[PDB]
Amino acid sequence: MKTEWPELVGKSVEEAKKVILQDKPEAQIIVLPVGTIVTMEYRIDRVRIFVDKLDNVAQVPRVG
Amino acid sequence: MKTEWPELVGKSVEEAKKVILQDKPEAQIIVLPVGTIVTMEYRIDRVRIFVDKLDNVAQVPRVG
Amino acid sequence: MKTEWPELVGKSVEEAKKVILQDKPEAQIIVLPVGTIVTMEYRIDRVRIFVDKLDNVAQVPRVG
Amino acid sequence: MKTEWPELVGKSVEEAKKVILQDKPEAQIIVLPVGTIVTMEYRIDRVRIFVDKLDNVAQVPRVG
Amino acid sequence: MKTEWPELVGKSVEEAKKVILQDKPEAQIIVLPVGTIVTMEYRIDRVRIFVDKLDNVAQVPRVG
Amino acid sequence: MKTEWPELVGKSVEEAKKVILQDKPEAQIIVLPVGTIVTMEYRIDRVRIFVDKLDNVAQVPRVG
Amino acid sequence: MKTEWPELVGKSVEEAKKVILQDKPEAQIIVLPVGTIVTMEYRIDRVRIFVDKLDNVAQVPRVG
Amino acid sequence: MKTEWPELVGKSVEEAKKVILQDKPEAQIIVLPVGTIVTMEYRIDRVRIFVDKLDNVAQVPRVG
Amino acid sequence: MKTEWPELVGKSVEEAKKVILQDKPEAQIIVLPVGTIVTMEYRIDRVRIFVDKLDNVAQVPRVG
Amino acid sequence: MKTEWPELVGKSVEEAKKVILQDKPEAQIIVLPVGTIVTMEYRIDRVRIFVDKLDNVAQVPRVG
Amino acid sequence: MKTEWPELVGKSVEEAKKVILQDKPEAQIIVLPVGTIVTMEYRIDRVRIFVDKLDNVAQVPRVG
Amino acid sequence: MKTEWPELVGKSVEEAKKVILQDKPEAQIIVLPVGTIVTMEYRIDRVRIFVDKLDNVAQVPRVG
Questions:
Q1: Which of B14, E16, H38, J27 has the fewest CB atoms within 10 Å, i.e. is most exposed?
Q2: Which residues are within 8 A (CB) of A60 and not within 5 positions of it... i.e. 6 or more apart?
Q3: Could you tell me which residues are beta bridge partners of residue D63?
Q4: β partners of residue B57
Q5: Contact with chain H for residue A42, Cβ under 8 A
Q6: Count of CB atoms within 10 A of residue L34's CB?
Q7: Does L62 reach chain E within 8 Å, measured CB to CB?
Q8: To 5 degrees, how large is the angle CA E51–CA C47–CA B55?
C-alpha cells in the first residue's frame, strides 16, 4: 500500500492533490501549515500535506 | 445519541454543518483551526469542527 | 449578579454584544480567539468573548 | 507619575492613544495582541496597549 | 561600534531602516513581530527590528 | 557540496531562489516564517529559507 | 448529578480524593499539575484534580 | 482488532501493562505524561499510555 | 479589602503563608512556579503565590 | 547505510545503545524525552533516541 | 544606579547573591531557570538571576 | 578565533568543559537542556552547551 509521497516535496498543493488521488482514489486530503500541532488518531484514508508560506509541499506527505 | 461524524473528514465546512444539523438539530457548531488549544468544559449541544487551511474538515467532529 | 452567558454559545459577536449589554449595561466587551493566552487580572466590568474562525461565540462568556 | 490607564479598558486604540498622549506627552505607544509574549526590559517612556481582535483595549495599559 | 538604537523605539519601520543604514551602511535589516522565537546565531552585519501590530518599532533594535 | 548561503541574509525570496537554483539546480525550496517549528527529517535536495514579515531572508539558508 | 467541588480548593489530594469518592463512588481520579495541556474527550466517571507544587488542589475539580 | 482500553482509565501503569499485554501480546508499551507533544507516525504494535502525576492512566490507551 | 502583598516579594513561602493568613484568615493559598499557565476563573478566597527555584516569592501575590 | 532502527521501539536505552553501536560503531548517541524540541542541523554520526518516562525507546531512532 | 551585572555571567548563585547584595543592599533576588516565561511588571528592588542546569548564572542579571 | 566544537558532540559535560577551557581559557560555560528557549544577546566569552537527559553534549557547542 502506498503510504508516502517523497516525490511531492517542493511541488504545489494542486499538483500534490492530483498525484495523491491518482495513487489513492479514496484519499481525504488535508492541507496544514508546517509546524501545526497535530494530536490526531490514525485514519488510513487521510493524507495530510504540510505546506510552506507559498502553499508548496514542505515535508513528505504520508497516510494517516 | 450521535456523537461523532467520521464521514465528514475531508468535506467542506458547509457540507459538515448541513449534515451535523440534520443529525443534531440543536447543534451549536464551532469552527476552529487544527491545533487550537482547547481548554473547554463539556457542552452536549456543541459540535467543534477542526478545519485545515482550506476550511475542510481535518479531524472527526465530536459532540462536546 | 449575572456572571455567565451559556445562552450565547454559537451565536454571533453582534448578537452576544447586544445581549450582554442588555444584561450588563457597563460591560467592557473584549473579543479574542479561542486559545488565546490570558494572563489577566479580574475586572468586574469586563466580559471576554472567545470566538471561532467565523466570529461565533465558542465558549460561555463570563465576567472578569 | 501616571503609570496605568484602567479607564481605557474597552476603548479603541485611537481613543487610548489620544488619552495616553494627553497624560504622557513623551509616550512611545506600542500596540500588541493580547497573549503576545513579551520578554522586554523596562522603558519608562513606553506604553504597551494589548488589544483584542477588534483593536479594542483588552487589558489595563501600563508604562514600561 | 554602534550596536543599539534606543532612539528608534516607537518609530516606523521606514524611519528605523533609514536611521540604521545611516549608522551602519552594511546593515541587513530583518523585521519580525514581537514575540517571535529566535533561535539564531550571531551576525555582526544583521539588525533585527521587532515590530508591533502597526509596524512600529517595539523594542530597542540591536546588532546580531 | 554547497550547503549554506550566508550571502543571502537580507535578500528577497526571489533573489534567494535564483541564487540557490544556480548553485543547486535540483533544490526544492521551502519558504517558512522565522520561528516555525520544524520537526523534519534530512533531505539533501531541500533548502529551507526562513523569512521575515517582509519576505526577506532572515537566517542563513542551509540544505536539509 | 454532582459535577463540581469548589469546597476542595486549597485542600490536599488525599482530602480531595476522600470527598470526591464519598460523592461519586465510581470516580476515576486523575491528578495533574496546573497548566497541563489537556486535549481530552469527556468521561462522565473521571474527575481531574489540578494541583499546585505542594499537591494542594488549585482549581475547582469538575467531572469530565 | 482491539484498539482501545477505556477500562484502564484510572488504573496504575502496572495494571494497564498487564491487561494490554494479555489483549495484545506483541504490544510495545510507551508511558508518557499527559500533555506530551506527540508528533509520531502510526505503529500498529505500539500502545501509548498517558499518565498523571501519580502514574495512573489518565486517558484511554489506544494503539498507534 | 486587601488584595495584594508587594511586601512579600523575595520572602519564603512559609513567611508569605503566615502573612497572608494574618491578613486574610479564609485564604486558600496555592503555590505555583513562575510562568505557569493559568487559565483560571476568579476566586475571592484564593491567593496564588508564584515562586522561584528556591521557593521564594517572585511576583506580588494577589487575590483571585 | 543503516539509518533507522524500528526494531528498538519499546526497548530500553541500554539495549538500544548496544544495538546501535553494533550497527554504527561511530554513533554519537543522544537520549532525549519525547516531545523535546529539536532545532538541530544534520549530523551523519549522531543518533537521537526519544524515550518515555521509563527510559524506554518511544519512537524509531534515526540518524541525524 | 547599578542596573546590570555582566561580571556575574558564569558564576554561582551564591557568588551572584553576595555581589548583588554588596551593590544593592535592598535587592530581592529571584532565581529562575533560563527560558522561564516572565510576564512581570517592573520592580526597582528586584533582581532576577537566570540560571543553568548547574545553578550558574547564564545571562546578565538586571534590575526589574 | 575558535567558535565551535563539533568534536564534543556525544561527550560528557566534564570532558566538554575541559576541552573548551583548553581552547578558550576565559570561557564562561553554561549547561542547558536541549530545547531550552534562548532569547539571549551575544557574549563573546560565553559557551553554551546543550545536553541530553544523560548530561551528554547533544549539539555543537558554539561561542555566544
A1: B14
A2: A4, A5, A6, A8, A9, F41
A3: D47
A4: B51
A5: yes
A6: 20
A7: yes
A8: 60
Partners of residue I9 in chain K, C-beta under 8 Å: 28, 30, 43, 45-46
CA-to-CA distance for L33 and L46, rounded, in angstroms? 16
- Rounded to whole angstroms, how far apart are CA atoms K34 and B56? 40
The answer to whether H7 and H29 are in contact (CB under 8 A) is: no
DSSP 8-state symbol, F59: S
Q: Residue C5: which domain range?
A: 1-64
D36 inside 8 A of chain E by CB: yes
A54 at interface of B, judged by CB pairs closer than 8 A: no
Q: Residue F46 forms beta bridges with which residues?
A: F28
Q: What is the tally of structural domains in chain D?
A: 1
Nearest one of H55, H60, H58 to H10, comparing CA atoms:
H58
CB A27, CB B50: distance < 8 Å: no
Q: Kindly state whether K54 is in contact with chain L, defined as any CB-CB distance less than 8 angstroms.
A: yes
For A3, the grid coordinates are 503510504
CB distance A32–B52 less than 8 Å? Answer: yes
Return d(Cα A17, Cα A19) in angstroms, integer. 6
Which segments of chain H does DSSP mark as H helices, in order? Answer: 13-23
Distance CA J18, CA J32 (A): 17
Distance, CA of L53 to CA of A45 (rounded, Å): 38
- Cell, residue C7: 445562552
Chain B neighbours, 3+ Cβ pairs < 8 A = A, C, G
For this PDB entry, the determination method is X-ray
Which residue has 555582526 as its cell numbers?
Answer: E44
User: How far is residue F4's CA from residue F24's CA, in Å, rounded to a whole number?
Assistant: 11
Which residues of chain I neighbour C41 with C-beta distances below 8 Å? Answer: 62, 64
Contact, A60 vs A17, CB < 8 A?
no
Q: Nominal resolution in Å?
A: 1.3
Q: What is the DSSP string of I1-64?
A: ---B-GGGTTSBHHHHHHHHHHH-TT-EEEEEETT--------TTEEEEEE-TTSBB-S--EE-
Q: How far is it, in rounded angstroms, from Cα I28 to Cα I25?
A: 9
